[PDB]
Coordinates of C-alpha atoms in Angstrom, one line a residue:
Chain A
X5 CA 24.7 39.4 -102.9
X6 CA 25.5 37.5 -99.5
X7 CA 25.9 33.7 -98.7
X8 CA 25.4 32.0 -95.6
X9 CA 27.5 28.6 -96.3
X10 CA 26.7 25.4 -94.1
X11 CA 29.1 23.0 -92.9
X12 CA 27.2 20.1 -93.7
X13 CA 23.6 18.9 -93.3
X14 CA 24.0 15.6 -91.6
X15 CA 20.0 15.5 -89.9
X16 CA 16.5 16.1 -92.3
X17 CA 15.7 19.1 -92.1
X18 CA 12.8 21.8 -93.9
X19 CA 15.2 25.0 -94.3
X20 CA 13.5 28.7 -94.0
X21 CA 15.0 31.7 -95.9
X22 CA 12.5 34.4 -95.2
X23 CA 9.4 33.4 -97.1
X24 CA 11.1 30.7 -99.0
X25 CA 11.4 26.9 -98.0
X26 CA 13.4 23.8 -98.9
X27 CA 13.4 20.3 -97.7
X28 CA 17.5 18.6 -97.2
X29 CA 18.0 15.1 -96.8
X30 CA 19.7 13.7 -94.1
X31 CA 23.2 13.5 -95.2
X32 CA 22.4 15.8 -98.6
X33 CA 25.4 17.5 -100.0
X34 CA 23.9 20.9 -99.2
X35 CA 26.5 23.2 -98.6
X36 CA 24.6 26.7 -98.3
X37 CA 22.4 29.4 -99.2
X38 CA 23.6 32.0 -101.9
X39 CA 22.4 35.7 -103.6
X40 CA 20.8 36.5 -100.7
X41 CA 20.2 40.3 -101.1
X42 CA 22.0 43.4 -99.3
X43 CA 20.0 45.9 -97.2
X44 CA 17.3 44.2 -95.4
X45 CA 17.4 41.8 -92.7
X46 CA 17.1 38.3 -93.0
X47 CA 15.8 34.9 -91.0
X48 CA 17.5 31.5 -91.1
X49 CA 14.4 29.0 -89.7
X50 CA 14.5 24.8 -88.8
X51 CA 11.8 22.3 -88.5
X52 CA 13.9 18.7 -88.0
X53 CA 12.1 15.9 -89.9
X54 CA 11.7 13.5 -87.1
X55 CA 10.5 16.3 -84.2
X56 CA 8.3 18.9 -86.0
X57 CA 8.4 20.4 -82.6
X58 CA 10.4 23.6 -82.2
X59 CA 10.8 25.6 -85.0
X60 CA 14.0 27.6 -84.3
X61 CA 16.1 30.2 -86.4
X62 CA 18.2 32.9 -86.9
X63 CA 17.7 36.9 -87.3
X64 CA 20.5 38.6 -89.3
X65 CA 21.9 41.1 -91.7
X66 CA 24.6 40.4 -94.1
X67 CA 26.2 43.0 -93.7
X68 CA 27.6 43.2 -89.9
X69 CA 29.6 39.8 -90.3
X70 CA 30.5 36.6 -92.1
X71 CA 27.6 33.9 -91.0
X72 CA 27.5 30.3 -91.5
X73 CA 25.4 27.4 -90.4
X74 CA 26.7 24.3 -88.8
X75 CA 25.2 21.1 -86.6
X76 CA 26.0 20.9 -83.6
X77 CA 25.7 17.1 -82.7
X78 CA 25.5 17.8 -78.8
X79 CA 22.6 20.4 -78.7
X80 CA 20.9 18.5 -81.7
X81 CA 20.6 22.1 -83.7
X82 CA 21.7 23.9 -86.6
X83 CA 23.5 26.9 -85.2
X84 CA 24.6 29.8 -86.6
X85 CA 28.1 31.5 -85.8
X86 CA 30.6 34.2 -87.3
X87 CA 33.8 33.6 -88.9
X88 CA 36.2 36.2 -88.1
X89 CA 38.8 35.3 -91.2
X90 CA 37.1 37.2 -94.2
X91 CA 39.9 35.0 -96.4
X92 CA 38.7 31.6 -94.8
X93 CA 35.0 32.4 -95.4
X94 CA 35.6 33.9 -99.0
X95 CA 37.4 30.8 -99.6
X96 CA 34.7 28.5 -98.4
X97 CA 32.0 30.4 -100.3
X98 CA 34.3 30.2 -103.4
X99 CA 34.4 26.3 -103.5
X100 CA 30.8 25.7 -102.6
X101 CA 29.4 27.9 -105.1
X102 CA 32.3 26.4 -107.9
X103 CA 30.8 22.7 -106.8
X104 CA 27.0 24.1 -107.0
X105 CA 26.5 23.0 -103.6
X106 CA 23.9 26.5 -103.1
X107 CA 20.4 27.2 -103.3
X108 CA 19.9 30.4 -104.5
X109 CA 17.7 33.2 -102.5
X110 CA 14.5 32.9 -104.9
X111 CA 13.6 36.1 -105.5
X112 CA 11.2 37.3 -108.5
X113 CA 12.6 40.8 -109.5
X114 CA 8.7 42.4 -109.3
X115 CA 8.2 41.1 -105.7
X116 CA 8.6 43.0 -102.9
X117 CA 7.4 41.2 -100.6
X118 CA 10.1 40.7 -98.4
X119 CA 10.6 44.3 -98.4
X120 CA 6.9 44.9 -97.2
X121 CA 7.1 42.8 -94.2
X122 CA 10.8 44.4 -93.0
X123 CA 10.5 47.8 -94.2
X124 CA 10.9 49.0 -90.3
X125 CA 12.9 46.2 -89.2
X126 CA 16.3 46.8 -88.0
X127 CA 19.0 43.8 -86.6
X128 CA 19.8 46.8 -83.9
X129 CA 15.8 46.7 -82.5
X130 CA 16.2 42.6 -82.6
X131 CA 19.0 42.9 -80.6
X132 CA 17.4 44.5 -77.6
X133 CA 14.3 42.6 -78.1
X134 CA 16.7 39.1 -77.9
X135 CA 19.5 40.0 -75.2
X136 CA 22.8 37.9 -76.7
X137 CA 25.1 40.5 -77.0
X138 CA 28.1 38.4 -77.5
X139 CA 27.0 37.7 -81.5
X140 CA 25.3 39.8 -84.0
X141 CA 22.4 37.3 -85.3
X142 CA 19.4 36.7 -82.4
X143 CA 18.2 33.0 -82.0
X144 CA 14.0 32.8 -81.9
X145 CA 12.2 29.8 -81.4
X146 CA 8.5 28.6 -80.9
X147 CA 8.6 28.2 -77.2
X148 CA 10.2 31.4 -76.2
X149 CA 8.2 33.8 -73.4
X150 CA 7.6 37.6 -73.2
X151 CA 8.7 39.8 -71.0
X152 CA 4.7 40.2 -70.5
X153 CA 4.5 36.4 -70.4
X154 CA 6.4 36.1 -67.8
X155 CA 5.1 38.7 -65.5
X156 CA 1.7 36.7 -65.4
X161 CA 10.6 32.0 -66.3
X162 CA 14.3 32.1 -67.7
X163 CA 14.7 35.6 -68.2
X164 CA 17.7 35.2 -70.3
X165 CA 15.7 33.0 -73.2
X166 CA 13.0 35.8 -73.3
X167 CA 11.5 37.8 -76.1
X168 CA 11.7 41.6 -74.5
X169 CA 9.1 43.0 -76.6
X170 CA 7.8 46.7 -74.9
X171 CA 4.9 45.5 -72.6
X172 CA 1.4 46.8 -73.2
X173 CA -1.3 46.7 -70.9
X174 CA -4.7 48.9 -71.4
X175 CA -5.7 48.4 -67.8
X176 CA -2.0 49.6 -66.3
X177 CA -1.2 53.0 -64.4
X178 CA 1.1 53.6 -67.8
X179 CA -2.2 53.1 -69.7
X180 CA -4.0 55.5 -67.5
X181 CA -3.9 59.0 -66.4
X182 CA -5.8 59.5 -62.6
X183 CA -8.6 61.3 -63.3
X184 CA -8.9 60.5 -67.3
X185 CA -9.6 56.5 -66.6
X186 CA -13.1 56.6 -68.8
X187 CA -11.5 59.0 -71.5
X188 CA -8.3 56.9 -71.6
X189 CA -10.0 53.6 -71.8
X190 CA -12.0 54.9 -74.0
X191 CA -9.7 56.7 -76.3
X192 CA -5.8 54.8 -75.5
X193 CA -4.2 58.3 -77.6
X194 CA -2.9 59.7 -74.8
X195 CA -1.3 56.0 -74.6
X196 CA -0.3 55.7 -78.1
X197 CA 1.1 59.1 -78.9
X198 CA 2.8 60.4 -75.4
X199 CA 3.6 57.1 -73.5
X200 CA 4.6 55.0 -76.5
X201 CA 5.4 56.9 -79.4
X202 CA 7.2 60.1 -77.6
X203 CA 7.9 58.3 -74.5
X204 CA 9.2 54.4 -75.2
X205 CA 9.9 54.2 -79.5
X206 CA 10.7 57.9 -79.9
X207 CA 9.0 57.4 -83.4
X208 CA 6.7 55.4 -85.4
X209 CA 9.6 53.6 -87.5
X210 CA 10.6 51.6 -84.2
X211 CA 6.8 51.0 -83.2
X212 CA 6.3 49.3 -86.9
X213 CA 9.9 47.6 -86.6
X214 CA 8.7 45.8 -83.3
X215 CA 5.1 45.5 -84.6
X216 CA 6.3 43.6 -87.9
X217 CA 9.3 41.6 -85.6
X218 CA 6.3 40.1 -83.7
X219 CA 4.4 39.1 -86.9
X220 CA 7.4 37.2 -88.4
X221 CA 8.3 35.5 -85.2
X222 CA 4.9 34.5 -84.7
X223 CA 4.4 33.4 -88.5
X224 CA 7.6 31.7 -88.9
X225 CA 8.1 30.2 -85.7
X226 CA 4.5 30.0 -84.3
X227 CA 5.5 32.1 -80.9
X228 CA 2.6 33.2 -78.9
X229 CA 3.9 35.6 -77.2
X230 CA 5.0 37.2 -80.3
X231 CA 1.4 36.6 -81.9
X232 CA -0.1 38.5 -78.3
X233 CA 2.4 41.4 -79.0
X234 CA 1.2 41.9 -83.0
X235 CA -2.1 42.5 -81.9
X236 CA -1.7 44.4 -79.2
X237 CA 0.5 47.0 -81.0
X238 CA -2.3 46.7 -84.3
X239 CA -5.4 47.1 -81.5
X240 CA -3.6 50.3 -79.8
X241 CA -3.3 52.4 -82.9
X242 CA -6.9 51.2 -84.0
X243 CA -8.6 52.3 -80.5
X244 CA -7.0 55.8 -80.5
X245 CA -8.8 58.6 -82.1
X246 CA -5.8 60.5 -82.8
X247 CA -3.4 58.9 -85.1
X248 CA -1.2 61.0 -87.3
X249 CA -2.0 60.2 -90.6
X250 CA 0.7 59.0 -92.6
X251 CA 1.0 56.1 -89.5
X252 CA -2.6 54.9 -90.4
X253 CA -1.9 54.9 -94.3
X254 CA 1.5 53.2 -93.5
X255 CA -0.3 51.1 -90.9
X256 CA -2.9 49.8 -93.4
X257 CA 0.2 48.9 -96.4
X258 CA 1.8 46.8 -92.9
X259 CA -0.9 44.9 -92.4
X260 CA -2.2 43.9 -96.0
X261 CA 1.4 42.1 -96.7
X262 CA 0.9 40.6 -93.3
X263 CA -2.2 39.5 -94.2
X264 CA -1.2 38.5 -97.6
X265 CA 1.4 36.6 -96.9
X266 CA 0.2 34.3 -94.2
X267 CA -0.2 30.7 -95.0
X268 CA -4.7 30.3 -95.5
X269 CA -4.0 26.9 -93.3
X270 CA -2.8 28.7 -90.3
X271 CA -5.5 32.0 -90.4
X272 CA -7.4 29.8 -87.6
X273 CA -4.5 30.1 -84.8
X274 CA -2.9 33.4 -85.7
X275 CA -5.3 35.5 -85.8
X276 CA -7.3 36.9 -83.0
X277 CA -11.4 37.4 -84.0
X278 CA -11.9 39.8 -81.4
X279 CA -9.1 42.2 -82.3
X280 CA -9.5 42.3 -85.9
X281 CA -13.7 42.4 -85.6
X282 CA -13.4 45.1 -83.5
X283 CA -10.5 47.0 -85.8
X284 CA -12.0 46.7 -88.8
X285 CA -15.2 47.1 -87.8
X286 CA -16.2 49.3 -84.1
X287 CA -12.9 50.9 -83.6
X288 CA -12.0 54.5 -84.2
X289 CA -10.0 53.3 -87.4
X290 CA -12.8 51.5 -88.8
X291 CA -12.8 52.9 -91.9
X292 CA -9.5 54.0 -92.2
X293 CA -7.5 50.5 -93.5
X294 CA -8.9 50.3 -96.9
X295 CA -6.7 47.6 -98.3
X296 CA -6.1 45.5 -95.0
X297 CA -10.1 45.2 -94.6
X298 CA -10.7 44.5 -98.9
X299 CA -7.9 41.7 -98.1
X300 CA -9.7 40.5 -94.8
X301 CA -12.6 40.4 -96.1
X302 CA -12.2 38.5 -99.4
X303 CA -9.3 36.1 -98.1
X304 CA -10.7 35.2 -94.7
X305 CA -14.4 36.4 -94.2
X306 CA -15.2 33.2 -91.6
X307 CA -13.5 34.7 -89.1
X308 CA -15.3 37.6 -89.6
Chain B
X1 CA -13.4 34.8 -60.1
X2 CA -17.4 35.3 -60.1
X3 CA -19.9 34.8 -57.3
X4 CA -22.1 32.0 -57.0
X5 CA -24.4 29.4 -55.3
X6 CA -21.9 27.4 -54.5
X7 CA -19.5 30.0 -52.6
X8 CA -22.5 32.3 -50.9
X9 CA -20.9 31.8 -46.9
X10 CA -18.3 33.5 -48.5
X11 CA -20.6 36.9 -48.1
X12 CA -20.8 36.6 -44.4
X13 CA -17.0 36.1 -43.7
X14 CA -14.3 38.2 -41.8
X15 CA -13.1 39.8 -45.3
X16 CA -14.3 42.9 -45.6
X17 CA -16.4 43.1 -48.8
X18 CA -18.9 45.2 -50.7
X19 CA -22.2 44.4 -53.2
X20 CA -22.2 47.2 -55.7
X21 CA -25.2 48.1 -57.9
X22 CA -25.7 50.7 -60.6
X23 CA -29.5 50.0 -61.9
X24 CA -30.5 53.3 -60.6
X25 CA -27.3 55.6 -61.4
X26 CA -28.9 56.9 -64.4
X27 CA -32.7 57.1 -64.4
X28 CA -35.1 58.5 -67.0
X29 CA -39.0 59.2 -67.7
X30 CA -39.3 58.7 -71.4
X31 CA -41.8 61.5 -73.6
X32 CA -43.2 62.7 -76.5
X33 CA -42.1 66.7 -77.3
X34 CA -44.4 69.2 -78.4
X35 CA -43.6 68.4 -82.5
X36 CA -44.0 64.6 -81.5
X37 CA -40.9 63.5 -80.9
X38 CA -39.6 61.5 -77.7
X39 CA -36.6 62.6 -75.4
X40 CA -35.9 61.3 -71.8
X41 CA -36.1 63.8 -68.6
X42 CA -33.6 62.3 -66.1
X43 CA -34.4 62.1 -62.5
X44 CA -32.4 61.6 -59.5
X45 CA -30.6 58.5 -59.1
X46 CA -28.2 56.6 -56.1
X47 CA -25.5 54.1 -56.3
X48 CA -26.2 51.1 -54.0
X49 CA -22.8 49.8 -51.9
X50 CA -24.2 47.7 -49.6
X51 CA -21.3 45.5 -46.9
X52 CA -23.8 42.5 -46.7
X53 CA -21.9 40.8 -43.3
X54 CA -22.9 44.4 -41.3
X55 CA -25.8 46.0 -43.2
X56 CA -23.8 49.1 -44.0
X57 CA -25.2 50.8 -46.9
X58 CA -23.4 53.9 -48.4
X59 CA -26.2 55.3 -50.7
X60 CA -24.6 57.6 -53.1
X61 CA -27.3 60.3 -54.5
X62 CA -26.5 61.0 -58.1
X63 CA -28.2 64.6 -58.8
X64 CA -29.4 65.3 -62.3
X65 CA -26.9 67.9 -63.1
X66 CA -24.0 65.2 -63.1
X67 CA -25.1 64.6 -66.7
X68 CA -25.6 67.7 -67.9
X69 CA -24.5 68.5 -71.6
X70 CA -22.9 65.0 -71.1
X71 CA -23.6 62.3 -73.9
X72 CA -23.7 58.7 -73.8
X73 CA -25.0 58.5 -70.6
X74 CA -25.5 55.0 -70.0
X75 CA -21.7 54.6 -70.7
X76 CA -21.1 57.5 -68.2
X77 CA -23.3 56.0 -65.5
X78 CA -21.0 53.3 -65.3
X79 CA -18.0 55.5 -65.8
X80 CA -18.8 57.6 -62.9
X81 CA -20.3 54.5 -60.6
X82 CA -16.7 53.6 -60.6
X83 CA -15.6 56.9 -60.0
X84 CA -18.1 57.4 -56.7
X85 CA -16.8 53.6 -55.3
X86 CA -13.1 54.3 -55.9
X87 CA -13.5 57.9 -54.0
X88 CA -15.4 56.4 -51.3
X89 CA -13.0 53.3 -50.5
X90 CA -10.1 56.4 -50.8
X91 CA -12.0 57.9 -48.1
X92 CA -12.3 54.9 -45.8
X93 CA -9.3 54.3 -43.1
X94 CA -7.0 51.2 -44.4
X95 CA -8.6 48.7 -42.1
X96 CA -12.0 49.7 -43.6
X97 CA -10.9 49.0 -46.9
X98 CA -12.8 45.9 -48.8
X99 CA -10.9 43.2 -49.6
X100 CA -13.6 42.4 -52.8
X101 CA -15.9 44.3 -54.4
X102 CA -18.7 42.4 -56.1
X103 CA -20.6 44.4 -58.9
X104 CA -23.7 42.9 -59.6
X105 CA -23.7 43.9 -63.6
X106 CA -20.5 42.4 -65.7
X107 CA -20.8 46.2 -67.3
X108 CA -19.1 47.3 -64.1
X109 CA -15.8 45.6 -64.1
X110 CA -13.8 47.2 -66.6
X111 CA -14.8 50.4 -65.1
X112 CA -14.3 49.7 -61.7
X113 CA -11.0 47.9 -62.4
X114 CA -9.6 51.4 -64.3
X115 CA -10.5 53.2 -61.2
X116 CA -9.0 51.2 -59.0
X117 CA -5.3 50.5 -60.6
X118 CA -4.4 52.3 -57.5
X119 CA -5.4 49.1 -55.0
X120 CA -4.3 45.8 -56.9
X121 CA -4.9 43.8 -54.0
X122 CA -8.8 44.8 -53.8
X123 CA -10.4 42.0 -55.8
X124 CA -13.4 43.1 -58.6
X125 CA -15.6 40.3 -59.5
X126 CA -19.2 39.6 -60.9
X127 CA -21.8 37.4 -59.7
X128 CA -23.9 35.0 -61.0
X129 CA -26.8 35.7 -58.5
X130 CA -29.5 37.7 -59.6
X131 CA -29.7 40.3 -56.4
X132 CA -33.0 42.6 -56.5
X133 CA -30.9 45.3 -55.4
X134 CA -32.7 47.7 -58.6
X135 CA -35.6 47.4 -56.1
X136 CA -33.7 49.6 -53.6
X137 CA -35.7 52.6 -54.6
X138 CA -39.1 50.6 -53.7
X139 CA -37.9 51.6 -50.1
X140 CA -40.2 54.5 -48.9
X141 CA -37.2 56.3 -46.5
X142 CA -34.6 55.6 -49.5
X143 CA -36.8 57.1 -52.4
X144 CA -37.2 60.2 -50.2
X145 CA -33.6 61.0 -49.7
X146 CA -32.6 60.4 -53.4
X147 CA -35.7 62.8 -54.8
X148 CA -35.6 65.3 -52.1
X149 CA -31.7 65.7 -53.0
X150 CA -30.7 69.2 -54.2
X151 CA -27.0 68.5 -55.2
X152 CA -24.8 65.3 -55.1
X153 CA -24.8 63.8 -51.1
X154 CA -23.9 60.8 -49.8
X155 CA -26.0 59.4 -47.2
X156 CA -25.6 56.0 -44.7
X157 CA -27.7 53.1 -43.8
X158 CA -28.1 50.4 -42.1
X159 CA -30.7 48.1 -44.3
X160 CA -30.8 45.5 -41.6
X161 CA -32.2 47.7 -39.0
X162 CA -31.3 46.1 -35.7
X163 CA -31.7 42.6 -37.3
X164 CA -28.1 41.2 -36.4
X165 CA -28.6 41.7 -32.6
X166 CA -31.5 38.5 -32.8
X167 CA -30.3 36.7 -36.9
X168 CA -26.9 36.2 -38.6
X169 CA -25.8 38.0 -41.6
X170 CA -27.0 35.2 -43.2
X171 CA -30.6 35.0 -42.2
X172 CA -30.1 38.7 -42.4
X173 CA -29.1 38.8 -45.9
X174 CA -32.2 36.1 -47.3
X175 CA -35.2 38.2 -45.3
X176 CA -33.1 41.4 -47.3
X177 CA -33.3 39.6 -50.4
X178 CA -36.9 38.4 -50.0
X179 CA -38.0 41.5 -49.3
X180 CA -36.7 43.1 -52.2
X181 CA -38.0 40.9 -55.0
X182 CA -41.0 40.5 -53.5
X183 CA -40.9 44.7 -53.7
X184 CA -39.4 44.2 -57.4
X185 CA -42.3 41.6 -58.5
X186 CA -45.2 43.4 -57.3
X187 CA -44.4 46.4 -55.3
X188 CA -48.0 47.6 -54.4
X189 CA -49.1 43.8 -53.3
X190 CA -45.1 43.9 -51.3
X191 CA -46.2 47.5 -49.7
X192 CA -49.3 46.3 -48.6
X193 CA -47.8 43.1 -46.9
X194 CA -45.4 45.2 -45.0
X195 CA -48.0 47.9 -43.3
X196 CA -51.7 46.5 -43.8
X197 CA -51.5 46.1 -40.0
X198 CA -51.2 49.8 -38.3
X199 CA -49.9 48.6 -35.2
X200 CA -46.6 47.6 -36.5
X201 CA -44.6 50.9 -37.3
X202 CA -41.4 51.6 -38.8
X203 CA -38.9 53.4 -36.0
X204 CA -38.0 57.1 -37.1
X205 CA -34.2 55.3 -37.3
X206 CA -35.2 52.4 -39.7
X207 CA -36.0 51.3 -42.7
X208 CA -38.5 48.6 -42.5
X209 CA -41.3 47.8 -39.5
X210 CA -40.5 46.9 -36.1
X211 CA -41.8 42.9 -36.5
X212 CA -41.3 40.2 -33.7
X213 CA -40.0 37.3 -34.9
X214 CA -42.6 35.4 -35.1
X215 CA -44.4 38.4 -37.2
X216 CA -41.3 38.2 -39.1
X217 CA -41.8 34.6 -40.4
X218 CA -45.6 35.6 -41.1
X219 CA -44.4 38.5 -43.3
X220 CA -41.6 35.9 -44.8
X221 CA -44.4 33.3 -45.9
X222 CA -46.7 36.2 -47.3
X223 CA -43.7 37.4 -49.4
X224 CA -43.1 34.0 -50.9
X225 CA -46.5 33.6 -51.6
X226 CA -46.6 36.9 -53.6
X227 CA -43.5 35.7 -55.7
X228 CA -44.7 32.3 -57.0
X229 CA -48.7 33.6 -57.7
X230 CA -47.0 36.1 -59.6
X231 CA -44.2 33.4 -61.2
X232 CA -47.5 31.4 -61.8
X233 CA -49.0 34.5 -64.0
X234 CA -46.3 35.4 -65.9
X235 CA -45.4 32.3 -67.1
X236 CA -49.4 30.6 -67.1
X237 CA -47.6 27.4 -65.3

């Protein structure tokens, strides 16, 4: 079980652990954030008392490095960095958890939650999506552009998600455009999944990367990107089988776990209408459509 | 974006554009079968790409046997509209090339805009007018080609005649569009209108009869006349 100490919380601030959530005080002895469990990646997430503008965090995984919080008075954010002395670090940890100065990572032992939203989610993928290669945790915040975005400006603060576009010469074989429109497989299976991911684990890493960055930090682009990846598979005809299964497990804890409040901005009526109800898949997500359906049936 | 009221001058400029209609791509007689039951018999139908600045009219002939053992074909029609346009602009020399095309159905643009990935800078848009251009096959010489046609053909017009030598492309375009919902509104009353007087024919090289332009603006006033009677009826006002 990993920590992520913090220097010191000297501005109010709600603190995000994954799912979880915690208001400091300005000034609050708050020293950290301990038992946070091995073997999945994690998200470190900000919304200042006094601007509720930009939510901002941190992607990482416990395992590549030693990671602590601390405020940076100049920029005016909580900023995440590595110490490179295990010794120092163990001996920080040491103390804060001895004084109690920790929340500990609240998880119930029957919920796998946080599991079922990361399953294909690998701090290697975030990397290339969020180009920093000098540290080993990626920085997201709620103002952030695609790639995509961008094409329709800093191209060094930009989410590099793969770029979809059903009405693109990738999209479209000459002389199949009705059949490809139509049916995107050929799109799905050769250009995507055998082309660009190589395999469906990386397709459902970036697909459920886009969820959590739009969820936790209210990122458009990110929002645009989880749909486009959900309405691809559902307008092909031709999906292997264990992806739509897999697929339909994705979505229900994506649907699960979103906050009721926020249904009416994150998700699009058009794309989940037309999944759930005229698309090739229509009948093929059991549990994301019985969730849907009895959690959020306005929007449908 | 879309075509309007308020941006109509816009048809008779420099840039070279195109009206494209697909009303009678795919056309059916509906009837009952032996046991009782209906099916459809398609017939002959045309594309209508019509430059409305020089009158050119490229009127592709769609022969039944495009749909055979096809299904959906009123998805196809528009499927293979957008085929026929995006071969025939391939066809056409670079300076030829339109610079818009304007589909009078919104059913057009997703299919048009697939087929032509190829030529991002040729702009698709819709229109809000409501252009009689279904009536197309109300014109005598036009009905003729498309029924006579044994296999697919494409064959050009001029549905201006030798208008732009005395009107604009304006004026040109208004008589045009008079003519054809007058045609679309009551096509025997229209018919009648344009040859009750035997002395006024219609040249082996044209579409419509050889009027002066003061027999011109005669026909004009009988063809409003037909529209609002008949505006009058349907709607009892």
């Amino acid at each position: 079980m990993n920590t992520v100490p913090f220097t010191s919380a000297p501005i109010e601030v709600t603190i995000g652990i994954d799912q979880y959530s915690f208001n400091v005080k300005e000034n609050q002895p708050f020293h950290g954030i301990k038992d946070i469990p091995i073997g999945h990646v994690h998200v470190i997430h900000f919304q200042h008392a006094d601007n509720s503008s930009m939510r901002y965090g941190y992607w990482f995984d416990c395992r590549m490095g030693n990671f602590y919080i601390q405020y940076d008075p100049k920029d005016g954010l909580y900023k995440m960095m590595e110490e490179r002395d295990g010794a120092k670090f163990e001996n920080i940890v040491h103390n804060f958890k001895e004084r109690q100065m920790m929340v500990s990572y609240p998880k119930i032992d029957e919920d796998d939650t946080w599991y079922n939203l990361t399953e294909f989610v690998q701090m290697d993928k975030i990397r290339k999506i969020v180009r920093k290669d000098e540290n080993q945790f990626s920085y997201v915040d709620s103002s952030m552009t695609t790639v995509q975005e961008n094409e329709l400006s800093d191209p060094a603060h930009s989410l590099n998600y793969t770029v979809i576009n059903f009405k693109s010469r990738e999209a479209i074989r000459p002389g199949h455009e009705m059949e490809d429109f139509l049916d995107k497989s050929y799109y799905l299976n050769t250009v995507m999944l055998q082309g660009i991911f190589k395999n469906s684990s990386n397709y459902f890493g970036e697909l459920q990367f886009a969820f959590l960055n739009a969820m936790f930090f209210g990122n458009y682009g990110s929002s645009l990107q989880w749909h486009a990846m959900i309405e691809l598979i559902c307008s092909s005809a031709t999906v292997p089988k264990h992806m739509l299964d897999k697929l339909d497990e994705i979505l229900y804890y994506q649907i699960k776990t979103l906050p009721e409040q926020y249904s009416d901005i994150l998700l699009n009526e058009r794309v989940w209408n037309i999944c759930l109800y005229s698309s090739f898949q229509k009948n093929s997500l059991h549990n994301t459509e019985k969730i849907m359906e009895n959690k959020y049936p306005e929007l449908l | 974006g879309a075509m309007n009221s308020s941006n109509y001058a816009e048809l008779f400029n420099n840039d070279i554009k195109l009206f494209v209609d697909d009303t009678n791509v795919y056309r059916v007689t509906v009837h009952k079968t032996f046991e009782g039951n209906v099916a459809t018999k398609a017939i002959n139908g045309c594309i209508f790409t019509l430059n409305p600045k020089t009158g050119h009219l490229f009127l592709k002939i769609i022969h039944t046997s495009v749909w055979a053992g096809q299904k959906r074909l009123s998805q196809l029609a528009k499927w293979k509209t957008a085929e026929e346009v995006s071969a025939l602009v391939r066809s056409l020399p670079k300076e030829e090339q339109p610079k818009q095309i304007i589909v009078t159905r919104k059913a057009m643009l997703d299919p048009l805009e697939v087929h032509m990935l190829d030529f991002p800078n040729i702009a698709i848009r819709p229109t809000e007018l409501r252009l009689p251009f279904s009536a197309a096959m109300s014109i005598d010489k036009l009905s003729d080609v498309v029924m006579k046609a044994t296999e697919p053909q494409m064959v050009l017009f001029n549905i201006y005649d030798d208008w732009l030598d005395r009107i604009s492309s304006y004026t040109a375009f208004s008589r045009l569009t008079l003519l054809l919902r007058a045609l679309k509104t009551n096509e025997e009353s229209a018919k009648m209108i344009l040859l009750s007087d035997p002395t006024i024919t219609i040249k082996s090289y044209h579409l419509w009869p050889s009027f002066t332009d003061e027999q011109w603006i005669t026909i004009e006033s009988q063809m409003r006349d037909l529209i609002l009677t008949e505006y009058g009826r349907k709607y009892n006002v």
